[PDB]
Amino acid sequence: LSLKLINERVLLVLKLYDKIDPSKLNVESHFINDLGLDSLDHVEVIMAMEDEFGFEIPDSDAEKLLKPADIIKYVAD
Amino acid sequence: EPKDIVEVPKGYVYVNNKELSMEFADITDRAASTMFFGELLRGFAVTLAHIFKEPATINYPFEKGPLSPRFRGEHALRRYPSGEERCIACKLCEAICPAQAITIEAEERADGSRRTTRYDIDMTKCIYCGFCQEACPVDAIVEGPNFEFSTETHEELLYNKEKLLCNGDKWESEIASNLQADHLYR
Amino acid sequence: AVQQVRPILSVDREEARKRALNLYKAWYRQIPYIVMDYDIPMTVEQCRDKLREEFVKHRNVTDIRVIDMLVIKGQMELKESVEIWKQKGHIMRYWKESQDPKPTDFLSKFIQGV
Amino acid sequence: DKPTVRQPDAVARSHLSDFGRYVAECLPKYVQKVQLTAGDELEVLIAPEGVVPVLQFLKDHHQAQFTNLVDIAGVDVPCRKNRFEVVYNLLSLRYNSRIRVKTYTDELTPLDSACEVHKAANWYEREIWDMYGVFFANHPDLRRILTDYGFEGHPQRRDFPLSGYVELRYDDEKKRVVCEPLELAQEFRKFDLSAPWEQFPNFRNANPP
Amino acid sequence: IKASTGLTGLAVSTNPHHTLSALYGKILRAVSKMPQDASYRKYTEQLVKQRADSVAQHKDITALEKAVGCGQVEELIVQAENELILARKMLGWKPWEKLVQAAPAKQWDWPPAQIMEP
Amino acid sequence: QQTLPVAEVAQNLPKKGYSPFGTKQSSVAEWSLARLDDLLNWGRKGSIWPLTFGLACCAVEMMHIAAPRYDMDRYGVVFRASPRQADVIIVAGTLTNKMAPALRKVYDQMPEPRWVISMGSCANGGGYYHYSYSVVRGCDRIIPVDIYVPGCPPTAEALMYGVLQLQKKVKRMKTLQMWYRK
Numbered sequence: 001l002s003l004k005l006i007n008e009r010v011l012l013v014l015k016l017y018d019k020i021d022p023s024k025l026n027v028e029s030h031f032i033n034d035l036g037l038d039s040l041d042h043v044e045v046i047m048a049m050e051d052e053f054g055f056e057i058p059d060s061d062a063e064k065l066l067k068p069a070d071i072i073k074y075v076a077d
Numbered sequence: 078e079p080k081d082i083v084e085v086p087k088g089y090v091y092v093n094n095k096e097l098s099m100e101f102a103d104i105t106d107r108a109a110s111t112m113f114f115g116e117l118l119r120g121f122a123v124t125l126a127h128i129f130k131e132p133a134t135i136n137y138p139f140e141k142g143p144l145s146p147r148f149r150g151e152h153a154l155r156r157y158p159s160g161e162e163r164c165i166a167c168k169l170c171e172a173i174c175p176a177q178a179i180t181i182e183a184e185e186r187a188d189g190s191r192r193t194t195r196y197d198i199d200m201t202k203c204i205y206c207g208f209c210q211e212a213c214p215v216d217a218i219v220e221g222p223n224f225e226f227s228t229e230t231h232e233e234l235l236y237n238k239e240k241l242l243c244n245g246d247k248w249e250s251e252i253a254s255n256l257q258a259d260h261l262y263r
Numbered sequence: 264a265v266q267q268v269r270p271i272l273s274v275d276r277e278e279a280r281k282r283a284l285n286l287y288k289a290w291y292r293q294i295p296y297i298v299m300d301y302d303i304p305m306t307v308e309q310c311r312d313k314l315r316e317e318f319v320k321h322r323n324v325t326d327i328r329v330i331d332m333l334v335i336k337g338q339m340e341l342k343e344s345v346e347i348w349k350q351k352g353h354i355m356r357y358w359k360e361s362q363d364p365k366p367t368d369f370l371s372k373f374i375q376g377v
Numbered sequence: 378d379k380p381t382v383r384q385p386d387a388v389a390r391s392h393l394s395d396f397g398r399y400v401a402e403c404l405p406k407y408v409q410k411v412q413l414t415a416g417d418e419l420e421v422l423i424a425p426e427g428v429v430p431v432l433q434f435l436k437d438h439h440q441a442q443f444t445n446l447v448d449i450a451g452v453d454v455p456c457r458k459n460r461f462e463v464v465y466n467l468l469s470l471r472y473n474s475r476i477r478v479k480t481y482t483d484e485l486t487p488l489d490s491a492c493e494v495h496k497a498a499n500w501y502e503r504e505i506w507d508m509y510g511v512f513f514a515n516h517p518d519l520r521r522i523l524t525d526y527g528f529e530g531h532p533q534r535r536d537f538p539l540s541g542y543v544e545l546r547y548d549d550e551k552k553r554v555v556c557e558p559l560e561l562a563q564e565f566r567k568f569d570l571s572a573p574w575e576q577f578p579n580f581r582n583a584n585p586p
Numbered sequence: 587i588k589a590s591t592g593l594t595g596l597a598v599s600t601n602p603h604h605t606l607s608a609l610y611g612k613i614l615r616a617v618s619k620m621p622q623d624a625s626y627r628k629y630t631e632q633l634v635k636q637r638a639d640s641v642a643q644h645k646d647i648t649a650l651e652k653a654v655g656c657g658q659v660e661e662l663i664v665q666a667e668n669e670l671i672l673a674r675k676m677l678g679w680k681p682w683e684k685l686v687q688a689a690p691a692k693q694w695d696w697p698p699a700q701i702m703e704p
Numbered sequence: 705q706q707t708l709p710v711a712e713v714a715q716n717l718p719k720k721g722y723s724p725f726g727t728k729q730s731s732v733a734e735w736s737l738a739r740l741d742d743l744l745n746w747g748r749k750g751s752i753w754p755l756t757f758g759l760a761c762c763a764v765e766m767m768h769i770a771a772p773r774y775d776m777d778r779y780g781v782v783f784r785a786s787p788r789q790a791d792v793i794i795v796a797g798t799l800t801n802k803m804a805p806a807l808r809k810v811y812d813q814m815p816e817p818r819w820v821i822s823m824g825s826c827a828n829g830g831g832y833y834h835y836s837y838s839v840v841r842g843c844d845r846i847i848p849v850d851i852y853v854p855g856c857p858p859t860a861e862a863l864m865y866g867v868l869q870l871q872k873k874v875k876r877m878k879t880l881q882m883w884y885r886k
């Protein structure tokens with residue numbers, strides 16, 4: 001559903017997010033290993049992402065999210 | 078009289094036990110009061126009656142009291158009729174003071190008598206319990222009759238020995254009279 | 264040196280890790296309300312740092328029962344702050360603003376005295 | 378023959394002794410020990426898990442009918458391994474008697490709340506959590522009841538300084554009251570109230586290992 | 587019939603003889619499920635018989651209260667409603683078993699913090 | 705300590721006069737302000753409205769000052785509830801930390817000129833709980849204090865004597881006479 005619109009949003013959240021670099025900002029990039037974000041920082045991003053999309057992700061739904069690929073696919077719902 | 082809804086055992090009094098009669102003689106009596114403010118009428122008689130009593134007010138400060146010789150008030154260090162201070166820095170008063178309001182430092186005087194070089198009471202910490210005057214073995218410290226020593230500064234409520242000694246001279250006549258009239262009980 | 268004990272809230276470190284993150288959610292959601300409803304100098308970004316700064320204090324904690332207690336107390340404050348039972352003074356108490364810095368270098372402490 | 382010594386109430390002592398044993402048979406799983414205090418008052422020392430069972434038994438059993446829960450006192454003893462003890466004072470109006478139930482817990486281990494049996498313990502348990510730091514599982518809403526909001530620590534533990542760590546003052550810069558590290562004009566003057574000579578020989582050899 | 591119970595919020599009971607009889611009957615069934623050697627089973631089973639028979643023996647509630655003492659018939663019901671709750675709850679706890687938690691050393695020692703010389 | 709004058713010495717002293725500023729003003733403008741300054745002080749002196757704080761067991765003896773025996777109202781003292789209309793605050797009791805922000809605010813809401821009275825040892829210096837972990841060691845840490853009434857609790861007359869000290873303190877304000885020099 002409007003995947004490109006979804007993709008630009010998800011990647012916008014990361015670029016809009018601070019303490020991160022737009023380098024390595026691919027769909028396959030790994031948050032805690034490649035992007036190298038603290039597990040607290042990880043929560044800040046995804047739970048900031050809920051603001052732009054206006055969704056509400058439970059923890060058991062939020063835990064799966066490990067990559068922008070996981071988010072962007074999960075976002076499709 | 079109406080009956081009691083609950084029978085009463087011995088050694089017990091009930092406050093709302095009597096039921097309400099249903100005879101016209103009584104219902105009308107309740108109705109009349111409920112209808113012409115009868116209950117409130119006697120309430121108004123009582124309050125008006127108090128207009129015609131001497132009010133119990135006292136014209137302080139011209140008239141004041143009454144108190145008793147046991148009254149606990151401001152502190153004062155007494156002294157013997159010779160003039161020598163009674164306190165010997167035994168420090169019983171310091172140890173018993175519930176509020177720890179007393180600080181004493183003692184030193185061998187020049188003439189060699191056990192005496193205080195310091196005796197401070199923090200009147201903003203004292204509770205006027207009176208344990209100090211009960212513990213003093215020589216009646217050195219007493220709670221004088223004075224109860225009018227409000228100040229305008231916190232610092233002025235911390236008494237050092239010179240302030241306490243001054244009180245023991247200003248109030249000496251009355252303290253000696255209270256102790257005489259009260260020591261036998263104590 | 265291990266002993267059998269009764270759990271507090273969680274049974275596994277992973278569940279404890281899960282609970283702690285939720286407490287971060289609820290606080291991070293709540294900062295915008297606290298700024299509005301308290302007459303305090305601090306802004307959302309400053310506060311959102313204070314949340315990060317202090318969750319870091321308990322960085323080396325390992326025992327799940329200790330982590331449970333921190334989350335019990337951590338949750339209690341949030342309810343007392345989601346409500347305005349905590350007054351303006353108490354919220355700013357998290358910054359210790361009144362206390363001025365005490366230098367750490369030896370020469371400064373020596374000159375300043377103990 | 379001697380007026381100063383208090384006269385023991387033997388009849389009340391007799392009933393409590395036998396009924397004290399009675400509880401021991403009915404609740405073997407939990408009742409560790411039953412003892413009759415020198416004040417002719419019964420104490421029932423239970424395991425930590427037997428709180429809700431034992432309290433239920435005393436309130437509902439025909440013979441006990443300890444319907445009225447009066448207190449929940451907490452006692453801190455750093456010497457013991459389970460430093461925190463919790464004491465319930467129950468009253469039985471129908472039988473006109475009092476019984477005490479004690480239990481022990483650690484700093485961390487939770488203690489099963491007894492709001493169910495006697496929901497008079499709604500606040501008493503809240504106080505215990507606040508004052509000592511004993512957590513009560515299954516409580517409706519545990520929360521500090523006495524100390525200041527955001528007060529850190531648990532004041533009534535024996536390992537807590539008397540004056541606390543922080544005072545309050547008003548700072549006209551901030552237009553609000555601020556907390557600073559404690560600073561007393563006059564220290565709390567200790568007194569060493571320790572007698573060098575033992576006075577109560579009956580307790581010298583008491584409590585053999 | 588009592589006009590009033592005398593206690594606020596406690597209503598006079600209709601057929602207290604039936605209500606008690608059912609409750610005592612229920613208790614003996616719940617108690618029966620418990621192991622025979624359980625001391626609680628021996629006491630309530632003995633007790634409830636002493637209460638149960640008096641309920642059937644007497645047909646006048648005033649006479650019943652004297653025969654049993656222990657409060658008004660309304661309270662007698664209130665009591666009986668409890669041991670159902672206790673007896674039912676206690677079939678889950680199984681209190682008759684051995685001591686669940688052996689006491690720690692010095693955990694019931696008073697006065698505390700004294701050197702013990704071996 | 706300055707002792708009182710002897711009768712014979714005092715038998716010569718002139719009558720004190722009401723105003724504490726005397727009638728020795730050099731100019732008309734100064735003298736009018738002095739007399740006009742008395743009019744203010746006479747007003748504020750007459751009607752001092754406490755706030756009905758009543759925190760702790762000094763509060764009970766703060767009721768008996770309004771009781772018929774001593775009758776605070778004789779002096780124009782009238783208890784009031786709202787801090788807006790209240791002129792004086794009688795902090796009577798132990799001001800604990802949980803209360804401390806509440807007293808500060810209530811005091812701030814009081815409009816000037818506002819005077820504070822400290823009743824009893826608790827509010828004076830922390831009193832019997834001076835060393836407690838949850839007690840403000842005296843209300844002067846939080847709000848300025850204008851009169852300290854010692855006691856525990858202060859006797860009813862003792863507080864009455866305190867109130868009269870506040871009247872005398874009010875009586876000698878120089879709000880206008882100091883504007884002229886300013």
Ligand code: SF4
Binds near residue numbers: 205210
């Ligand atoms: S009256 Fe009591 S509290 Fe006051 S100084 Fe004496 S002993 Fe201490």
Ligand code: SF4
Binds near residue numbers: 216
């Ligand atoms: S008890 Fe009496 S003699 Fe002893 S130190 Fe105190 S005042 Fe002096």
Ligand code: SF4
Binds near residue numbers: 761
């Ligand atoms: S100063 Fe004394 S009377 Fe007043 S509140 Fe404190 S303890 Fe009570």
